[PDB]
Amino acid sequence: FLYFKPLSQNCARRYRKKAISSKPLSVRQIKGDFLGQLITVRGIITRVSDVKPAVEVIAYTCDQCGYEVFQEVNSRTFTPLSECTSEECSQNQTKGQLFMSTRASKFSAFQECKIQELSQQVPVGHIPRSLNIHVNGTLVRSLSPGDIVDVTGIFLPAPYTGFKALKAGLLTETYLEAQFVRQHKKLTSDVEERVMELITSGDVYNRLAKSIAPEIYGNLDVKKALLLLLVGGVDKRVGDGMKIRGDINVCLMGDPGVAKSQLLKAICKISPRGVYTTGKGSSGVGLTAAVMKDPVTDEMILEGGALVLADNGICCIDEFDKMDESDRTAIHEVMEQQTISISKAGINTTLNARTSILAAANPLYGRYNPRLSPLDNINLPAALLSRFDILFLM
Amino acid sequence: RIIWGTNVSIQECTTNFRNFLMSFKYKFRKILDEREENTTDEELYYIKQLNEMRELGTSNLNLDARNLLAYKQTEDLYHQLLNYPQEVISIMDQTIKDCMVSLIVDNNLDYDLDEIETKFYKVRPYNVGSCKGMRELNPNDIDKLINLKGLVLRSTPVIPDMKVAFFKCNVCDHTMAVEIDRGVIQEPARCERIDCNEPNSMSLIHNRCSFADKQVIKLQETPDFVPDGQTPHSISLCVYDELVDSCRAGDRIEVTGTFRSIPIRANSRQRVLKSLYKTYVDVVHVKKVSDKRLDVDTSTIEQELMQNKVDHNEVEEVRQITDQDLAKIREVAAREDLYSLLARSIAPSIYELEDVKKGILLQLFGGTNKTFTKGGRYRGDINILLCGDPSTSKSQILQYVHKITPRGVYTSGKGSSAVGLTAYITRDVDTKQLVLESGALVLSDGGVCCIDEFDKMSDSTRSVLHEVMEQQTISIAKAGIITTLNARSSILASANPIGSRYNPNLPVTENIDLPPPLLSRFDLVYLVLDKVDEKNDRELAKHLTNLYLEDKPEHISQDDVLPVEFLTMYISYAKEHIHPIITEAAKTELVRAYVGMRKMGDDSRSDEKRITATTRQLESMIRLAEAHAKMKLKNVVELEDVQEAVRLIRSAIKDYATDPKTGKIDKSVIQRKLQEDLSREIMNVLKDQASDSMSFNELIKQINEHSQDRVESSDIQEALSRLQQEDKVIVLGEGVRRSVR
């Protein structure tokens, strides 16, 4: 099974052409004329079914008229063809019926999935949109749900009416025929040239430490810690043993005057994939995950737990004090990063979330209790602080 | 004759296969296996099975494909099997019937040469090479011989299937019967033998017509490799007339069968089909339960196959054994630091807290199934809570174990419900039957489980434990159905003491939250307390910084070789080749150990605050000592093998008498007096023992054995060292000990 890989921008650099083929565009950007164009789109995979064998050349043996007839696989709706056209039994008043034979025919893997937007490509308005993909040929099983990936192929609606009524119209479903895949996050380009510019510009550490939150002045140290968080980027998958989360879990403490919610807006706007929420904004099951045992294929659907959305991003959290400690279990689960296991309602499986958690809390007594020691103001049981790495009471 | 569809010619295959069925011997198998030799000097195995079946009329011949493989000039067939089952099975049955005929024309009387030949013969080739579960199943192997494992979810009730029609006796009054030999059923237009009604409406009597059993068995494979995100998959199965009902719900069967692929219809009115075929597995053989309960049977002849299966246990269950592997095993068993070594060899990345590792190891080998005809269900395995100061490796030890075992099911607490913990039943209204679903505990049937935040678990939950942990059954009784699904499984829970650390001013069984019933339920409780040592602290810090030194760090601890992979096969050999029998001497020291445990626990104010030693302490001691003896490949429990069991149970409790809150901030005055009186007595002996020289061991047997339990004898070492400083005696070579002039 042959496929095509889109050219890099190197050729468009030297020879500008219809470069739209290799330009990664969102699914929102799919214009009515773009239907049929080899298009590379990026996002998040979801609901990828399991491998299903689909026939390609349907065979038909008669067992009486011998002639192995071969028909071509039409749109998914097809017909087992009728009495043979073989001449062995023909030219008489007799005709032996044919029937298929799986060995005689030929099959190939087939899979479906859907893609959603990066959440920094959707306006502050409408809902993100999905998009079907039919993975074909040997490219099967090379995919997974939740990976940043540039997928490329053709964009076609196939003709088929649901109710099979009289009026057909065109219910324009779609699919990106998987012609190539680029799973990013396992550049020597202009971006790296500007990176060299940056490394040469000096003070880059304290440079970013200043340019972070470039609307507010003061409390430089906490911005330093936020820099350390957003960079993160360490880990120790020790191999043949215990993994070690190389992510950061920094927490705050203070009063409205600190404007920490502004700092959070800042950071998880600055972080790609970043997400914001509040302590009471999402219930326990709301924030972790909600699974539905899909009855159609009786499979597992994950409905966007705040955390799983937060994978490979920083989760901003406010009002973490009022988060209903019965719900503190999920977060507490998060210290043990990239593993959220759920065993309820007939489903007992895990879903990993590579996440770093940023929290914003309040002293229980309002502003502060001078008469009382720290960690009284901070009601958090030490089994939570110990999961945090840095605490910044202000 | 070459086949138009397989190009696998018959005559050569049948010819080689014939003398294959006559040249077969146990030894071929042994040479490939490399195991130590007799099998009554390797009698002809196939004629053995064939005679036995002919006398028993089973007409079903189980077969391990690896046997046929291990014989010269048959590997051709061995692969064509994997590649052309639909016809190699046919030629196999042909050869089977034909060799039956040759055998009976050689063997005077059996079935009069005809009753045998009339009835068909089917073959049961199993263990053709364990495929890689579901997610590997390639649309390239649509017609091959797959092996699958995993429990079953639901079994459709027995479904009949037409095989021979019986058409209505017309007014012509001569009913006509005919088979089908395909999905088509032809009714002759004309009536019966005489054309009394040439135009005729022949009908069919769908009660006297024969039938065939077709049972559909859904299947949920084991979570051996399911990475994340997706629930383990499912592959519907069909079974045909002999293996039917060999697999009730809940069982943990294994299957070897051919893959298939069939289209579906959408409107079902027009003949038009749909692409993207659906797939199932036409089973051929079913390894029964992969268990050893043997309470009662389930089905017909199939149990004879089970008996033919269970006897070959050794190689088939180890799935790998060589006396170079077995030699390595016995060699490791010989090593002295074993119990220490293997401990760290579970989680090498884990630091000095070894006793936790020890208890975990003993959980892996858990117990032996003592099956009584009266009583029964004595929870053959154990269960280990562990608690302690936050950030003390507990959760990571759990990860580590769950990765170690080949059946683990990780699971969190407070993100799970009673249904998640113990499968939930459903009266399916489709066929009005009992389906079971997603028992986290049932997935762990055999092998360990893990549970975190065990405290944070809800009180509505943490109640199914109260049943499963001590009976390994779950008795569900809701609106539709009452039943008891047995889930044998050794739970292994983490914990967190209330608040966020100890309160050594608080009683211990209050510092732990769990009620005393459920607590005593736990076979063994650990208290992993965090210390301010500053002596281990820098050692731990180095023990982390070193793993950070490399990029791909391995062997984080001291560089002593330990078999990260070998130990798993070691475990899966130990738990299945040795069954410790508790010798008499063990009984005494076990009884006294229990008595001492309980009398110590006795108090008037021990009622509300302490943990009381109860019969489950004895259950713990026995089920745990026999596991220790299973380790080291010991066939029978010694006496000096329950002592460390007692030590482990005392890991939690060592330091309080009437009130809890151990405290115990670790040379005492009473230790002074002990050394002093020992010095007195030993000086008196050695001055009464005129032969002034005697070994330390001889001296011990002279004194420390005259009466009740022996002493440390390294305190004796300090005593004699004092007598060297004071110079009242002289060791005078290790062999003896003399006094001073």
Ligand SMILES: Nc1ncnc2c1ncn2[C@@H]1O[C@H](COP(=O)(O)OP(=O)(O)OP(O)(O)=S)[C@@H](O)[C@H]1O
């Ligand atoms: N260094 C600063 N620079 C600019 N504005 C600041 C600074 N410190 C405080 N503010 C202002 O303080 C205001 C208060 O912001 P809020 O979001 O209400 O505080 P906060 O983040 O909610 O703190 P919490 O969450 O209640 S403890 C913001 O609107 C900022 O404009």
Ligand SMILES: Nc1ncnc2c1ncn2[C@@H]1O[C@H](COP(=O)(O)OP(=O)(O)OP(O)(O)=S)[C@@H](O)[C@H]1O
């Ligand atoms: N002695 C030790 N050996 C190895 N790792 C250790 C040790 N002490 C602490 N750690 C590390 O410290 C972290 C503690 O993780 P865990 O103790 O498993 O989590 P946890 O203790 O369950 O947290 P809680 O509060 O008890 S739920 C992990 O990164 C461990 O690897």
